[PDB]
């Protein structure tokens, strides 16, 4: 078989940075046809680079490929927030066609502090069962936080959900949301609930509260 490993597993950058990775192949990719695919967060891979060096229509020129038989480059000379993705390559063996485990890039930028905002848990939720107090922390860098809750006081419940997002293609942001899940036969019983967020941008954890106002 002809198998490809292209470390760095994860890799870093800044807008400007000359970044580089390598499709390390085995012996001769038998005449060498090398293809570099960018897969952006659950999507179709897209050809940039293809008969080893060649790029096509559709791509700006942040991108030269090259090499002979055993190593292949992709010069991403300068990165914009949407170079945030996974980049894998493919070849010959002289049939069957292997692919590779691809390289992830995570665009860096100057930090921002989180915008928590709370929504009390819906008409059709309660009339029919229970309450997902969901709190969205939107548009931050560096992705790391600790989101806890103030059930009453700052009660340490369990049964709490989480979801982070993709790295955004415009602002190299990440965002995420939390949900406390509980019976009407506890939500209509405990009074003052807060999503507490901790992050290196503020000295405080930020605490946006609610106590039985709004329906």
């Amino acid at each position: 078989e002809n198998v490809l490993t292209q470390s760095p597993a994860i890799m870093s950058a800044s807008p400007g940075e000359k970044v580089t990775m390598a499709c390390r192949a085995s012996s001769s990719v038998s005449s060498t046809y090398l293809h570099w695919y960018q897969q952006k967060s659950g999507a179709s891979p897209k050809l940039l680079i293809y008969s080893t060096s060649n790029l096509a229509s559709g791509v700006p020129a942040r991108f030269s490929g090259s090499g002979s038989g055993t190593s292949y480059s992709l010069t991403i000379s300068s990165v914009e927030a949407e170079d945030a993705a996974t980049y894998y390559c493919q070849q010959y063996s002289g049939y069957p066609l292997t692919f590779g485990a691809g390289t992830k890039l995570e665009l860096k930028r100057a930090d921002a502090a989180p915008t928590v905002s709370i929504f009390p848990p819906s008409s059709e939720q309660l009339t029919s069962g229970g309450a997902s107090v969901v709190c969205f922390l939107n548009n931050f860098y560096p992705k790391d936080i600790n989101v806890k809750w103030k059930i009453d006081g700052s009660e340490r419940q369990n049964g709490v959900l989480n979801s982070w997002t993709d790295q955004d293609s415009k602002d190299s942001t990440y965002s995420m949301s939390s949900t406390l899940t509980l019976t009407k036969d506890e939500y209509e019983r405990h009074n003052s609930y807060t999503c507490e967020a901790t992050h290196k941008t503020s000295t405080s954890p930020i605490v946006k509260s609610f106590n039985r106002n709004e329906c």
Binding site: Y33, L34, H35, Y37, G42, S44, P45, L47, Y50, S51, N54, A56, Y88, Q90, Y95, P96, L97, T98, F99, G100, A101, G102, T115, S117, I118, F119, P120, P121, S122, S123, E124, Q125, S128, S132, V134, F136, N138, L161, N162, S163, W164, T165, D168, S175, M176, S177, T179, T181, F210, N213, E214, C215
Partner: protein, 216 residues
């Protein structure tokens, strides 16, 4: 136009045969191979074999033999794949792909054919609207929430106002929370485009016949 048309997702129990398809539609069929590439759950890509849109060529992976019947029917042009003994790690997505050139690595790939393989009962979502408080906040531009309680399997598709207000879209993933996968999705609308113009949320879930369009 051109397209590689694929239709998924099917959820099967462990054992069953997901009869999948792709319609190559548009270029010459005679000199072409629809390779069915497979993408791993949280992992990497790899390849099955390919099928000639005209005669019955099958060039095949020395592993993917037995879970792989790739087939074109003459009439109308269509490429098939039929995997059997569906076992818990075939639980990934599938592709169809195309030649303009000797770029031996495809430009024109298809859609997301997804397959989930597990013996748990289906659930329609329970799509819900969240209101915040009648207030003043942060900076003068408002955030509205829609969430979708546990459903089964993933996917579902949450959408907002379809065109007019594709505002600050960020759709949050799901956990398998017990069974049921769970969603939430966001916006930030200009405080004049809302309330005078109702903002809409919309959801679909194929394996539960669903459409829920919800207004805030």
């Amino acid at each position: 136009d051109v397209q590689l048309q694929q239709s998924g997702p099917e959820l099967e129990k462990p054992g069953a045969s997901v009869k999948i398809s792709c319609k190559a539609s548009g270029f010459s069929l005679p000199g072409h191979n629809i390779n069915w590439i497979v993408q791993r759950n949280g992992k990497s890509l790899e390849w099955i074999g390919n099928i000639d849109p005209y005669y019955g060529g099958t060039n095949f992976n020395p592993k993917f033999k037995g879970k792989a019947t790739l087939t074109v029917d003459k009439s109308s042009s269509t490429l098939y794949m039929h995997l059997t003994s569906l076992q818990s790690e075939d639980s990934a997505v599938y592709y169809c792909a195309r030649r303009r050139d000797g770029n031996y690595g495809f430009t024109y790939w298809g859609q997301g054919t997804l397959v989930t393989v597990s013996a748990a009962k289906t659930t329609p979502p329970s799509v819900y609207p969240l209101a915040p408080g009648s207030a003043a906040q942060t900076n003068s531009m408002v955030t509205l929430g829609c969430l979708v309680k546990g459903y089964f399997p993933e996917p579902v598709t949450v959408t907002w106002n379809s065109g007019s207000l594709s505002s600050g879209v960020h759709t949050f993933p799901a956990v398998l929370q017990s069974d049921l996968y769970t969603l939430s999705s966001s916006v930030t609308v200009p405080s004049s485009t809302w309330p005078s113009e109702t903002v809409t949320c919309n959801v679909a879930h194929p394996a539960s016949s669903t459409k829920v369009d919800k207004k805030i």
